[PDB]
Amino acid sequence: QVLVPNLNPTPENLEVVGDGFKITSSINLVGEEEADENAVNALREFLTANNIEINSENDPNSTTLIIGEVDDDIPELDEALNGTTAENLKEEGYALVSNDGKIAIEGKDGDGTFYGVQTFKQLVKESNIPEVNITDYPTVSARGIVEGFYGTPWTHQDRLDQIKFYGENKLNTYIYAPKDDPYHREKWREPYPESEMQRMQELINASAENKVDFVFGISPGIDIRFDGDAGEEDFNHLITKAESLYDMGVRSFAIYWDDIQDKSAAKHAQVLNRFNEEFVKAKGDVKPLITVPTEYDTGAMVSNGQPRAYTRIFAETVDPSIEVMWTGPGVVTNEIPLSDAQLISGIYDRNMAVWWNYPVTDYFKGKLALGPMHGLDKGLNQYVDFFTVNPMEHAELSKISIHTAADYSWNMDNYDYDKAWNRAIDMLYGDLAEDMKVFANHSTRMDNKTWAKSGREDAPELRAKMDELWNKLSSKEDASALIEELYGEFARMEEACNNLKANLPEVALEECSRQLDELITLAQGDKASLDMIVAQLNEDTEAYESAKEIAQNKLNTALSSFAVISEKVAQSFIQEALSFDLTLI
Amino acid sequence: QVLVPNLNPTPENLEVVGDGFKITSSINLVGEEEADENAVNALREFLTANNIEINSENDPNSTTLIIGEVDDDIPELDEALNGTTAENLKEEGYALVSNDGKIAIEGKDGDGTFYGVQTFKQLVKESNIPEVNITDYPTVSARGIVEGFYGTPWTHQDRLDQIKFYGENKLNTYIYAPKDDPYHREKWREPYPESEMQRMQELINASAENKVDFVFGISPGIDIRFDGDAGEEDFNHLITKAESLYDMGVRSFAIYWDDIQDKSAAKHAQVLNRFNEEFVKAKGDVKPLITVPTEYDTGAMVSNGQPRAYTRIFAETVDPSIEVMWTGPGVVTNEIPLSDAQLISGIYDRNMAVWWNYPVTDYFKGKLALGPMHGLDKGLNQYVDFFTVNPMEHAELSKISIHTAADYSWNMDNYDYDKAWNRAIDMLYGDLAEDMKVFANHSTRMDNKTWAKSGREDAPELRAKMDELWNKLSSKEDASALIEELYGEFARMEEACNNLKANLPEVALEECSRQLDELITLAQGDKASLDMIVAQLNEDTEAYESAKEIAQNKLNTALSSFAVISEKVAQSFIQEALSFDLTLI
């Protein structure tokens, strides 16, 4: 009878109180004079998009929408809320009540009001809305993305689209830090050309319109000089560089020390402290300084329960108000258990920031990382106050994983990776969701075979059916039913990928066409591998020898291609099938 | 001056009691006419081959060999042993004392005297013998090989040479059960043709001369009938077949029920019991009957602590005298822990026989299994009294692993797999042992990528070095010295293999030429992999692309080839290097 639509992030408190109601083609709007401008703009936009007019004069027979903040002078807001408010209720928190023709939205601040509008937009389908009482606020207070990868940086239009996407999903933090922007790191002293400054401006305006904090990152560590007149000259270059962005509206800064040879911990921190003093504190409206030290994962930072020398000196030197990011137990790592966050938090005795290197693929570019947040302790917020993911150079397909990060960082305690992953693809993909899940299911696990591994395993259910096939065959048990089933699975992989090639919008298709072709090749090799097994069981030598040729040729195509998908599953199945001797008789 | 040479098996109690001495050009021999016939005949062969004559006549000044059993009354033996004796040792035990120009060999029985001679043969080098006090006896009472694999059965010459090899290493059991001998299984009812029988006579005679129990296996399970007249006809067929081999001197027999679809536990065990009664006991001089049940690995036999339906019925129907074989926790598995043997021995209420599926490679024929007995509990004799290995269709190279089985089963408590493996190769390959070690080190681990896995990991020390390389490179640490060390290892892999190709005797070379060429190919890819890494460090794109094309080609060659070696080490390393992105900035 509505119902409650898919929502992201999952609201903290949601109660269904009624049958639901249709929103009139024309509404009455109250409070839009005092409410958060940004919030109201996002409301107007949605209303316009959905062919909903705003009444110039009040109308009894119309759906009424009331909007404002807690301390705004708005009587009707108090009334339609009927008891529950956002009072109450941390920063970015809000209350939403839909009941019998009225919709009320109240934020603790303007951010909350904006976010209340985002939930509203998600609640309405076909002008119908469920009847609910919502109170909501984030688990973690900074949530977002660091564009911090190697490779082709996101285009200006990519970033503008990403920023709207963060706002819509309650993500409030975007860190500008592309390794391959020359003015970010390689030529960090050099000022941005005019045309690129105008683009930053648009990005900064876009961030503000969406209640996202734009963080200007800089990475001087390759060749910054520390002592004497050169240290003076270089420190001034940092100040100059930050000022140009500040003067455009930037109020958040990051200075980064990763991926460099120099491990002068005291000098790094001293730079951070001087910048913090002469810029951050001196400007007065600037958020805490953000940094990553040269040791940034637990393997690098810690030896036998104790901080290594670099980490030790850095921790003892960097001012307490500076946000320090770390990536977890490893740079690209399976999990962050609570004990790791506890370890690092105690070392720095401060709440930590997380730089999560997933879905980034810059270290294994042939594979797309399409899985949810996976391995992050649901209790991490005890030690972590700031959470960001490093995405792929592929902006559109990063939205799947980013979508889950939004849910993880806003409602951490109830986060369910499988449900969040499904919900992400449903919400992003529409009619194509079921097919996109088939494909993406095979492309969640990242593994470069050495130091870098993270993500949910690829297609775990299918992997379990494959194992059971081998179990039955080696036990000489009848596998006819399981074989018939696996034909069904392989045919479904291929059909799903074909539907995706024919119907994915180009923005999506351009990022994954090769991996799609790759999964089809694999599915075909998997099918032929079944043919090979079935021939061996039928003692049909010629059907063997013909199926095996196909299987091997598909595996060889898959191995020689740039695109990489389903290594431990669709790919490995062929290898397993070719290594299983059923000619033993 | 003079050290104890490599011995196999490791004697139970050995002590160096002096400096050693040289045996003269001719000796006094004493006890020949009373000591065991096969022991003396083996002794004479050795004396003839090492250009040592026997006095006519006796004295000077000439070294004195005295030989016999405890049951014999030879004074010189008693004087020469000086307190040491075989009197209190188990069957197959012996005493050897070499001191002051005397060598005394006393067996507990004729088997023990023979083994005494075998130890003597290993003790003498260039006429020099260490002065020692040995008492010795096997841990496990039945120690041998079952030729029980699928594929081309060993040739008749193969078998004769194996049987002598078993003698020399104190293995006492040979089970004749090749899956693809028609008359063993496919045509189990049918008599062997005459020329086959003559070959069987030779096998039987050779076994007797080398104290080896020749065990005749029959596998009637595919199509044997049990009920009514058909069941009579078929039972008599078993009798006819056994009689024919008994009539030539066979006194041990096996009836195998493995790898069939018929799970008729009562019928199987009834056939066993009927044969035990009408053949084994009726003859009086036939050793206990040996069997394998259709369920023969713990996974197939047991469901949480308890026997499955078939095993329950088998265990409780089969006569207590019958030796039952099982393979361990799985058909081809990592280990047999004491707890597994306890569990299975519990169900059958007796000491078990082991059929150990290593070094057999019938299920993964591209790889040679050249490693030691690995994963078998060193206390297994508590529940096991019968130990055999299923070897490769490649008889010559099977000797490395068999050699280690001889040590494990004879001296279980002191069994050290690395040392036994080293000794095997030292003792078997002589001048080529160091090169053979390099190559064989890469070919210990069996793994069909699904249900079958067993053996020591391939080249473990190189694997750790590889691991340490990636840990340093991903921490952006200086690895120049290790890089250099690994260039040395890959070069030495290629060198060893080249020498093996040029100098292996043909009978070994014909079994491993393809695998030699595989390891060379991979060493070359490994070397190209290092070059590829070094180029990326130097930001030399041309050298990188060039080394990369080579490393990829070498890999693809190895992957496409029938021969398989060093999957997780030499081969994996190339895959690891290719996925390590060092072009990031």
Ligand SMILES: CC(C)C(=O)N[C@H]1c2[nH]c(CCc3ccccc3)c[n+]2[C@H](CO)[C@@H](O)[C@@H]1O
């Ligand atoms: C801010 C750091 C936590 C960090 O992750 N720095 C860089 C980083 N460093 C590393 C490990 C060291 C390394 C090895 C090879 C090439 C470049 C870096 C991995 N990463 C990320 C994933 O590839 C990459 O996106 C990121 O820009």
Ligand SMILES: CC(C)C(=O)N[C@H]1c2[nH]c(CCc3ccccc3)c[n+]2[C@H](CO)[C@@H](O)[C@@H]1O
């Ligand atoms: C007597 C049994 C303990 C036994 O191991 N039987 C056969 C046996 N059965 C099995 C498992 C069943 C099987 C699976 C696939 C193909 C053939 C048999 C494995 N093996 C051995 C290793 O391949 C093979 O040498 C052996 O002859």
Ligand SMILES: [Cl-]
């Ligand atoms: Cl899990």
Ligand SMILES: [Cl-]
């Ligand atoms: Cl193809």
Ligand SMILES: [Cl-]
């Ligand atoms: Cl029958």
